[PDB]
């Protein structure tokens, strides 16, 4: 055989990229916090008004609030070229909060998609008490499920010349864990909720079309807008992650430029993914006239 040596020189604009990401992340932090906080407040006040206010909406806002709230720790670590200045216990705690809440928010979207179709067909002769009970049961189940999937990553997350905190997975399964976990994150994050989103919005569009009274008040386009926005937020990031996995397994031949491209791509798409939590309030709450009226009341 022969050994080819590829000297990989330091990339020029790495510092610039990290500064740019911090610059985007601050905007994510501000907009996400503000949006979610006002939604939670308005949600509480709407129950007072006598509205059948969805439990799911309140929960979605809370879940997004937490994800957005774990941003500063990531920013601090990122500026120092992913070096870790905090403690191991800090690393574990921040990661667990980030993970549980992120999965939970996505799951609440999925619940709402199903709930639209159920509200038109099934729930219309169902007691008010019974539907509220169903929402509460689902709310507990989503939090529990979110907690369950988040836990393994935090367990193996341990702070490791230069200090970094990066998860060290079991000796004989390092590979397995890494790859496995991310794919679960991809499917549960995007494939499963996108499928649900598409199906129950296609059905919703069909149902509204069959109706004549409904379609006057409900736009046809906005239904598909929900589907397309979800697609846009998640697909690039998961593609970037998959490309990274391919490069590691070298089905993409190594180039210093390829590494630079991956580094840039992962970071940019990470910003796009984190924009998801900001955009969640707009789709389900802001469109509705009722929310706007309540929000005006709350504001004054």
């Amino acid at each position, epitope marked *: 055989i022969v050994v080819d040596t590829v000297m990989c020189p330091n990339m020029p604009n790495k510092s610039v990229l990290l500064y740019t990401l911090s610059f985007i992340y601050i905007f994510i932090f501000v907009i996400g916090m503000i949006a979610n906080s006002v939604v939670v407040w308005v949600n509480i006040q709407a129950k007072t008004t006598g509205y*059948d206010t969805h439990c799911y909406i309140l929960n979605l806002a809370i879940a997004d609030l937490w994800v957005v709230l774990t941003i500063p720790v990531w920013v601090v670590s990122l500026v120092q070229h992913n070096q870790w200045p905090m403690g191991e216990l800090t690393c574990k705690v921040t990661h667990l909060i980030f993970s549980i809440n992120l999965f939970g928010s996505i799951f609440f979207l999925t619940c709402m998609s199903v709930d639209r179709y159920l509200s038109i067909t099934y729930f219309t002769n*169902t*007691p*008010s008490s019974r539907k509220k009970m169903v929402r509460r049961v689902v709310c507990i189940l989503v939090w529990l499920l979110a907690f369950c999937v988040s836990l393994p990553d935090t367990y193996y997350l341990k702070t490791v010349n230069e200090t970094y905190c990066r998860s060290f997975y079991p000796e004989h399964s390092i590979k397995e864990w890494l790859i496995g976990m991310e794919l679960v994150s991809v499917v549960l994050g995007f494939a499963v909720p996108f499928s649900i989103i598409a199906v129950f919005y296609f059905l919703l569009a069909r149902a509204i079309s069959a109706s004549s009274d409904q379609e006057k008040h409900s736009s046809r386009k906005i239904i598909f807008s929900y589907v397309v926005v979800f697609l846009v937020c998640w697909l690039p990031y998961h593609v970037a992650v998959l490309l990274d996995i391919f490069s590691i397994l070298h089905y993409i031949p190594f180039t210093c430029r390829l590494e630079h491209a991956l580094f840039t791509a992962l970071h940019v798409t990470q910003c796009l993914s984190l924009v998801h939590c900001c955009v969640n309030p707009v789709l389900y709450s802001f469109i509705n006239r009722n929310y706007r009226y309540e929000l005006m009341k709350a504001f004054i």
Partner: antibody, heavy 125, light 101 residues
Framework: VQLVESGGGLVQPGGSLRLSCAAS????????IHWVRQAPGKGLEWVAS????????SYADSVKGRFTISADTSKNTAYLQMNSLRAEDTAVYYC????????????????????WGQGTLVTVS | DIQMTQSPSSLSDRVTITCRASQSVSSAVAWYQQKPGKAPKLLIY???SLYSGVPSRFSGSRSGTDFTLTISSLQPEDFATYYCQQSYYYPITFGQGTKVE
């Protein structure tokens, strides 16, 4: 959206009788149809309801089991079918609609019965 | 049934109809107006939100289990047996009727 009742008449106790609430307009499987009886010189009392999507009926205790409610979605109409007639049953039977629109959903409210018929008089002589 | 005590059952103008509930029912009450030999017309669904084509004189409120329909100035279309309803729990339970003479 118009409701017209066809039925009523004089029918001896222990009998049966059917009423129809013909609906012209709205999809009747995206709304629940309820019946409310006003007994002569006495208060209202809920009678029956149906969500035709899954045929999810629901009846008041007084008429529980002994009345039946069945709907057709092909032509919008709901049918209240009575059995075991009594003086209790003597009333003017109105058909009412609880309506729904999916434009709002997440910031919904607890709607009442809004589109009401004109009612047929059932007498149990 | 989840009982409701609607009072007074006779009335005559500042008309208030107070409806108490046996259990906490949360804004699923309804009020009505059935003119004699004519089907009811909705006046207030939820607990304070009027239905379309229902005048501004009608005003709902919830004070726990003490719901109330208010008519600040009475009109000759208001002589009807108003029936308190709750739909929070099924069976849907109607009041005792509030005749307005």
């Amino acid at each position: 959206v118009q409701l017209v009742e066809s039925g009523g008449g004089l029918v001896q106790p222990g009998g049966s009788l059917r009423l129809s609430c013909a609906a012209s307009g709205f999809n009747i499987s995206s709304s629940s149809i309820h019946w409310v009886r006003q007994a002569p010189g006495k208060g209202l009392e809920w009678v029956a309801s149906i969500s035709p999507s899954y045929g999810y009926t629901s009846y008041a205790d007084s008429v529980k089991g002994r009345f039946t409610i069945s709907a057709d979605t092909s032509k919008n109409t709901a049918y209240l079918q009575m059995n075991s007639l009594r003086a209790e049953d003597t009333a003017v039977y109105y058909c009412a609609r609880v309506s729904y629109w999916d434009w709002t959903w997440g910031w919904s409210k607890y709607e009442g019965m809004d589109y009401w018929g004109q009612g047929t008089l059932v007498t149990v002589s | 049934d989840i009982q409701m005590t609607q009072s007074p059952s006779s009335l005559s103008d500042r008309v208030t109809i107070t409806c108490r509930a046996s259990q906490s029912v949360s804004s699923a009450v309804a009020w009505y107006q059935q003119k004699p030999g004519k089907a009811p017309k909705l006046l207030i669904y939820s607990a304070s939100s009027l239905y379309s084509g229902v005048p501004s004189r009608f005003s709902g409120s919830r004070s726990g289990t003490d719901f109330t329909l208010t008519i600040s100035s009475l009109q000759p279309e208001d002589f009807a047996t108003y029936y308190c309803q709750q739909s929070y729990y099924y069976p849907i339970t109607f009041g005792q009727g509030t005749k307005v003479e």
